[PDB]
Design an enzyme around this catalytic site. Structure first.
Site, PDB file in Angstrom:
ATOM      1  N   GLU A  49      76.857  16.910  12.719  1.00  0.00           N
ATOM      2  CA  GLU A  49      76.283  17.307  14.020  1.00  0.00           C
ATOM      3  C   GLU A  49      75.565  16.148  14.706  1.00  0.00           C
ATOM      4  OE1 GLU A  49      74.181  21.023  13.711  1.00  0.00           O
ATOM      5  OE2 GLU A  49      76.014  22.043  13.038  1.00  0.00           O
TER       6      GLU A  49
ATOM      7  N   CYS B 146      78.700  29.649   9.854  1.00  0.00           N
ATOM      8  CA  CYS B 146      77.535  30.378   9.396  1.00  0.00           C
ATOM      9  C   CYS B 146      77.153  31.447  10.371  1.00  0.00           C
ATOM     10  CB  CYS B 146      76.337  29.442   9.095  1.00  0.00           C
ATOM     11  SG  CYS B 146      75.489  28.923  10.487  1.00  0.00           S
TER      12      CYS B 146
END
Ligand SMILES: *[C@@H]1O[C@H](CO)[C@@H](O[C@@H]2O[C@H](CO)[C@@H](O[C@@H]3O[C@H](CO)[C@@H](O)[C@H](O)[C@H]3NC(C)=O)[C@H](O)[C@H]2NC(C)=O)[C@H](O)[C@H]1NC(C)=O
Ligand SMILES: Cc1ccc(S(=O)(=O)NC[C@H](C)N)cc1
Ligand SMILES: *[C@@H]1O[C@H](CO)[C@@H](O)[C@H](O)[C@H]1NC(C)=O
Ligand SMILES: [K+]
Ligand SMILES: [K+]
EC number: 3.2.1.45
Length: 497
Positions: free
Chosen positions: A235, A342
């Site tokens: 990320e 997630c």
């Protein structure tokens, strides 16, 4: 085989309860004889990957829904499925008794479980860590003489990975991803917050950072682990944000382009680890196709990049066609791979919802979406968490397919585990996705693939409350007459000709 022992925690469906003496498991995998199909069924009402069989018939009549397999319409080849061995997952697993540890690892990695063939391995600490560390915390060590693996790796992660490998009959592939560099390489001198590498691609800071990846792979190779792939940064967009709460390292797409081209690509190419694949992005899909355009239209960067890793935050909405679809159209020879997914990360949502069918449907619906948009693999986040969704040193708790309750030496297999297993168990590495055409408008979600040995697998998800009768046609073999119950997921498998 052992069936699910179900338990309700008041959510829409049940978990399956395992402990030191019992866990649900399959018999050794076998195919039915020619002319027979296998059906595995899970339902909100509580069936959990229950096996049944039926005949493949020569004839069909009806004006009802027909899904016709398109075996010669070929799409992407599948790398596989798995999850992340974070510090948090390692701690949770090892907090169980040796028997329960083994039943948990079998659940994921053996043919008597759901046949995971991918493990994502953080390079040092992330949010799902209880200690903040890197592998080279002594400052100004630019040749990385003091690079070393701490016990989080040597005592927890590495031995667990070896145990999973021992249980797997499928070849398992490892993927590595870093969250932060040593703070003395960073503009802000902290593991978190807004901050990037100091200097510019091509210089001492960037060359040291690229050498850190090789040191990492060298250190795991001393423990007899080899990696299939690494990502350029977990990320990278996160490190551009002020106040970012946990480990990060910020790159603009231009920064990652130049880092890959000038430092990371060449360093890996010149190492013993030159066969390791490099994946760019490792971030959310709304960064596509811009990020891909920036990196892959530079030929010096392009020649090092094998794939694009994408993260799936299942609590949030984002376009698939304008991101994944468009990226595949512009860059059809650069594979797309889902490296993290997630659910339950929203602060106002309960991190762990024991028995949530909805979160199960989110996982399968996302996987189907991914496969239909050319993605070659899907990797869950933490393999196991506690009932709080931790541990996590910034309290960024989330859900996991397996929930460990140390006080009872028990673990709970979530709907998410079965939704994911409907895919992982039945789609080996090298499977190719193929076409599936509906004869009419319908509420079902579905995907078809062909095994390396030619066998068919079809997954059907019903997110509606209504039972939908349907027929699957395999033009070369015949017809499967079946039904897709409300709030169900089915996997079908058969031999072809
Ligand atoms: C790990 O979990 C196992 C499965 O839950 C446990 O084994 C079970 O223990 C139960 C209690 O001794 C056995 O009896 C049944 O218990 C249920 C309620 O849980 C009752 O409704 C039933 O009335 C009762 N049996 C009958 C005939 O009425 C279970 O039979 C037994 N199950 C199995 C599959 O063996 C283990 O005890 C547990 N292990 C540890 C170490 O905690
Ligand atoms: C993103 C995406 C997911 C699933 C699909 S589907 O499986 O084709 N079902 C669509 C319809 C409900 N019958 C298509 C596109
Ligand atoms: C299928 O249809 C044919 C043609 O009507 C019929 O004769 C036959 O009995 C049916 N079954 C098989 C297995 O061919
Ligand atoms: K060290
Ligand atoms: K939460």
């Amino acid at each position: 085989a052992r069936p699910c022992i179900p338990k309700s925690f008041g959510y829409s469906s049940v978990v399956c309860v395992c402990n030191a003496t019992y866990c649900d498991s399959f018999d050794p995998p076998t195919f039915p004889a020619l002319g027979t199909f296998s059906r595995y069924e899970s339902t909100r009402s509580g069936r959990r990957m229950e096996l049944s069989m039926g005949p493949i018939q020569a004839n069909h009549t009806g004006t009802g829904l027909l899904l016709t397999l398109q075996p010669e319409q070929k799409f992407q080849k599948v790398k596989g499925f798995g999850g992340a061995m974070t510090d948090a997952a390692a701690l949770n697993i090892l907090a169980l008794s040796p028997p329960a540890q083994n039943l948990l690892l079998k659940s994921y990695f053996s043919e008597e479980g759901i046949g995971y063939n991918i493990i994502r391995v953080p390079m040092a600490s992330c949010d799902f860590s209880i200690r903040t560390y890197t592998y080279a915390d002594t400052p100004d060590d630019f040749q990385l003489h003091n690079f070393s693996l701490p016990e989080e790796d040597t005592k927890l992660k590495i031995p667990l990975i070896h145990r999973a490998l021992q249980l797997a009959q499928r070849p398992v592939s490892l993927l590595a991803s870093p969250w932060t560099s040593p703070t003395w390489l960073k503009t802000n001198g902290a593991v978190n917050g807004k901050g990037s590498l100091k200097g510019q691609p091509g210089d001492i800071y960037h060359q040291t950072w690229a050498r850190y990846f090789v040191k990492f792979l060298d250190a795991y190779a001393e423990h007899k682990l080899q990696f299939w792939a690494v990502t350029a940064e977990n990320e990278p967009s996160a490190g551009l944000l002020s106040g970012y709460p946990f480990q990060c390292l910020g790159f603009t797409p231009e920064h990652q382009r130049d880092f890959i081209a000038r430092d990371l690509g060449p360093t890996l190419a010149n190492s013993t680890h030159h066969n390791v694949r490099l994946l760019m992005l490792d971030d959310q899909r709304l960064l596509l196709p811009h990020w891909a355009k920036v990196v892959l239209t530079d030929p010096e960067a392009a020649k090092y990049v094998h794939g694009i890793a994408v993260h799936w935050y299942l609590d949030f909405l984002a376009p698939a066609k304008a991101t994944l679809g468009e990226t595949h159209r512009l860059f059809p020879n650069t594979m797309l791979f889902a490296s993290e997914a997630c659910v339950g990360s929203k602060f106002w949502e309960q991190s762990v919802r024991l028995g949530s069918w909805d979160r199960g449907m989110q996982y399968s619906h996302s996987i189907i979406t991914n496969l239909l948009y050319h993605v070659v693999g899907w990797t869950d986040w933490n393999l196991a968490l506690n009932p709080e969704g931790g541990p996590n040193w910034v309290r960024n708790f989330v859900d996991s397919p397996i929930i460990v309750d140390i006080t009872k030496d028990t673990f709970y297999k979530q709907p998410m585990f079965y939704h994911l297993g409907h895919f992982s168990k039945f789609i080996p590495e090298g499977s190719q996705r193929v076409g599936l055409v509906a004869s009419q408008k319908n509420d079902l979600d579905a995907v078809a693939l062909m095994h390396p040995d030619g066998s068919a697998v079809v997954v059907v998800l019903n997110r509606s409350s209504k039972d939908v009768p349907l027929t699957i046609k395999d033009p070369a073999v015949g017809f499967l007459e079946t039904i897709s119950p409300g709030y169900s997921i089915h996997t079908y498998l058969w031999r072809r000709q």
